[PDB]
Design a protein around this nucleic acid. Structure first.
Lengths: 209, 114, 114, 122
RNA sequence: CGACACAGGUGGUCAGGUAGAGAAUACCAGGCGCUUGAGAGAACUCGGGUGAAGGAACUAGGCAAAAUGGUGCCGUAACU
RNA sequence: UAUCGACGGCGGUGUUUGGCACCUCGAUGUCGGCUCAUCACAUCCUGGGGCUGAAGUAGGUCCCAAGGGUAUGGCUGUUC
RNA sequence: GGGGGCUGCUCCUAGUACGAGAGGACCGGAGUGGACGCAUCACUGGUGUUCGGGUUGUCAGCCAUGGCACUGCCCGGUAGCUAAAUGCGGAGAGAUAAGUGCUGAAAGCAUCUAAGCACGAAACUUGCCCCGAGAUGAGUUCUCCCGAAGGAACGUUGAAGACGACGACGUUGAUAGGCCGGGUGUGUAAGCGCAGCAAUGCGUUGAGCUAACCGGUACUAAUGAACCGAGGUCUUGACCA
């Protein structure tokens, strides 16, 4: 069980004696039924599924191992009914969050940040903005220069512009686990978590805390 | 866009009026026939227009004949159709959809006053 | 409480929001922020109406303190750098919460006056 | 603050108002902020003694209308604009006393002599 | 009359119907509804309103828009 | 022979001008600007180097290299 | 298949190395600024014929309270969306050119080469983000299925959407409305008393009215029934019986 996964519910907060008041993001972490686990290998730098472990297959778990010893194994995802899990497959695949999750423990939560169509350079890849009177010239979120040397009237592919997005993966580290509570088996993560509500976020023991 | 606000089927003005009238229709005759976004917002024109018109007093009926321009079905809203809804909150006059009629294809119920 | 004000009573806990601010009321604020060698003593500054502040996280308002070039700015009360306040002149009127003017028009009979 | 703007003086050098001209090391469409040294040409002042009215000198912007946000999240705004005249002697005011408050970031890291002559600090 | 049930053109009388300086808006009398329809809260184009700070820096030219703008008192330059 | 470099000699390019006039001559709206897209290099730097009349610092000249960056304004319709 | 990161300032190192003096560095490690790039707004700020107020003409006899100029005009202005707002945007690894060298001949010496070999560029490849089974080496997995598995049509609404879709729900329901409460916006009510000659000035009222949020709650509103509808193709690669 390299980690668990839940669905973002929203953002709340819990004032704890130790530490100090800090917003907490509620995440629904519940019953799953992992039938198999797909393992990827790092051939150069292009993910490829080595093998898949079923309810009973020592011929695939063996390759999974060793490859891990070779450190060539990539991210691990397994055919699941609801959400993922690792060593959970070997048992029966049926498990609850209570089995994997403790509080006050550090965890790395990654996820795809929240279709928005085309956006302006600024609202887009964080481009700053026309500070100074530049803003007064109502030219707020515009680079003002598509590219140097009008000739070519071309914009260097580099010279970042506007485009499409939405519909970026980010793995924030050191996310303390406040507690596991709510109407349903959920999780309280300190601070905020990438992605919108309902989005699928994964948990993983902090690589370095 | 934004959340679900009101519904101006036509323009701005055509959208207070229409409420007044088609409001007095469901008190003069316990039967009416509009469309879809029909008297659903006219379900509102009446109640409000009931309550504040509940108990008879000075500063109550004065609100009645303000939204409804008529002395006939503003008097029969009291001493009838109240007290007649004595111990009943809401439910004043609801109504269920009905198959669309001829001419302009637009389904329509029949307000009524239970 | 509801899942909107159930997670706001902690940070900036609703410390008995001093009766006033209120209309013209000019309660001298406080402070305790370092910004420099953390040894900052108390302080003082006159205010005015231009009230502001909500439920959970409310704030003083547009200080509008004459002294100095002029004024503006304000820290939200309560705040990590907050202490008790006091009184001043007793009320007045116009419309507190949104009382413009006082700025772009600050003289004797003009200020401390509607 | 842009070119051809009229701002007030903060030192008792004999000048009253100042008209911005250019900024040192700032290739932008009209601009001059708090802390930036700009070349100027005073307008109103004492036309005698040492030809004041008409001469072009350097100065340092201290206060502006535009609101600047601080780490806490609060923005501060002033009424008009002001600046201080400086001579050839590397960042040194030509006047004796200064008028008006100053920012923090303008003390420790950059100017240590300007803070010593500053009466107020926000 | 204009080839058309063509928002074009075409003389006289009613200029005291009711509130303002007035044959200026609102409203009796009288006349009329003969200037194609139905369903989501896009881009773009035609008219128009409001826009922080600066404010003609746009432009051949402030074109356009805006500002001033009722009445009474005080007061009113060069030039002729 | 760091650098500058005549006389003379031998070439490349074809952006200039001149020439010829072989082609078009059964019509592909002007100049400048603006807006928007792609390509090239005779690299002005950044990067790595050679020389110096290279102490250092700051420069001058030259080589490889174009990946990126090479981008703006005041007067003038004006291209010097 | 698509893509970017460029540049500057400051601190430590030095007022030291170097230099008579004047003058005046470097490698490297850090902080930050300007500029150019996906989002998000809690904070600061901008919008509003929802709403509240003032007021002209006119009508309801006056008052109160309202209609009309499709907000009469004027004043102010909440939510969302937005910005002069905020959070995020590596390092590292691999390979040649110029060039620096190794071993080493043709010329038993020498030589970076001629065979061989060790190193060596912001750029290149990759990392990372985005798109992508029509990715022509045209994918993977599980289950169901060859006369009944499954699937299309409909109804009520959107965390959806520019006409042909997408997503949720359809009583094993809270999806929408009503009601109540919670969370909000305005500002002193009707009436009467004494107010007052009156406008409307007072007292009773720090009183009413209103909402495009949320919760509780099914009370109301989510049938019936029809129908699109292929049927384990052929040759062969092994195992099971």
């Amino acid at each position: 069980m390299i980690g668990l996964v839940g669905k973002k519910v929203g953002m709340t907060r819990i004032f704890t004696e130790d530490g100090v008041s800090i917003p907490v993001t509620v995440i629904e972490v519940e019953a799953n039924r992992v039938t198999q686990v797909k393992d990827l290998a790092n051939d150069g730098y292009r993910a490829i599924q080595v093998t898949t472990g079923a309810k009973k297959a020592n011929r695939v778990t063996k390759p999974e191992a060793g490859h891990f010893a070779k450190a060539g194994v990539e991210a691990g995802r397994g055919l699941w009914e609801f959400r993922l899990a690792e060593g959970e497959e070997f048992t029966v695949g049926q498990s609850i969050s209570v089995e994997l999750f403790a509080d006050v423990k550090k965890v790395d939560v990654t996820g795809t940040s929240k279709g928005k169509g085309f956006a302006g350079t600024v609202k887009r890849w964080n481009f700053r903005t026309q500070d100074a009177t530049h803003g007064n010239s109502l030219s707020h979120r515009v680079p003002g220069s598509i590219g140097q040397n009008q000739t070519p009237g071309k914009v260097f592919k580099g010279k970042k512009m506007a485009g499409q997005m939405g519909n970026e993966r980010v793995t924030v580290q050191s996310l303390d686990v406040v507690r596991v509570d709510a109407e349903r088996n959920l999780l309280l993560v300190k601070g905020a978590v990438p992605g919108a509500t309902g989005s699928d976020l994964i948990v993983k023991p902090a690589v370095k805390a | 866009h934004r959340k679900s606000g009101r519904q101006l089927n036509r323009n701005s003005s055509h959208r207070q009026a229409m409420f007044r009238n088609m409001a007095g229709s469901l008190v003069r005759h316990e039967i009416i026939k509009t469309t879809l976004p029909k008297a659903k917002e006219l379900r509102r024109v009446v109640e409000p227009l009931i309550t504040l018109a509940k108990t008879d007093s000075v500063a109550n009926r004065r609100l009645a004949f303000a939204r409804t321009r008529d002395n006939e079905i503003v008097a029969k809203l009291f001493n009838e159709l109240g007290p007649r809804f004595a111990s009943r909150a809401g439910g004043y006059t609801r109504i269920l959809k009905c198959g669309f009629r001829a001419g302009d294809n637009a389904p329509m119920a029949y307000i009524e006053l239970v | 409480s509801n899942i909107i004000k159930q997670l706001e009573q902690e940070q900036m806990k609703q410390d008995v929001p001093s009766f006033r601010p209120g209309d013209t009321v000019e309660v001298k604020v406080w402070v305790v922020e370092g910004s420099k060698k953390r040894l900052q003593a108390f302080e003082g500054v006159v205010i005015a109406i231009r009230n502001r502040g909500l439920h959970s996280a409310f704030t003083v308002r547009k200080i509008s303190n004459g002294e100095g070039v002029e004024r503006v700015f304000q820290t939200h009360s309560p705040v990590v750098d907050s202490i008790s306040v006091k009184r001043r002149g007793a009320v007045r009127k116009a419309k507190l919460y949104y009382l413009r003017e006082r700025t772009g028009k600050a003289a004797r009979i003009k200020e401390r006056l509607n | 603050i842009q070119e051809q703007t009229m701002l007030n003086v903060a030192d008792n050098s004999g000048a009253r108002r100042v008209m911005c001209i250019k900024v040192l090391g700032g290739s932008h469409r009209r601009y001059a902020g708090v802390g930036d040294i700009i070349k100027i040409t005073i307008k109103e002042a004492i036309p005698r003694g040492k030809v004041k009215k008409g001469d072009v000198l350097k100065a340092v912007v201290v206060r502006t209308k535009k609101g600047v946000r601080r780490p806490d999240g609060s923005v501060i705004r002033f009424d008009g604009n002001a600046c201080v005249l400086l001579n050839n002697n590397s960042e040194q005011p030509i006047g004796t006393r200064i008028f008006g408050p100053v920012t923090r970031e303008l003390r420790s890291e950059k100017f240590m002599k300007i803070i010593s002559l500053a009466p107020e600090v926000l």
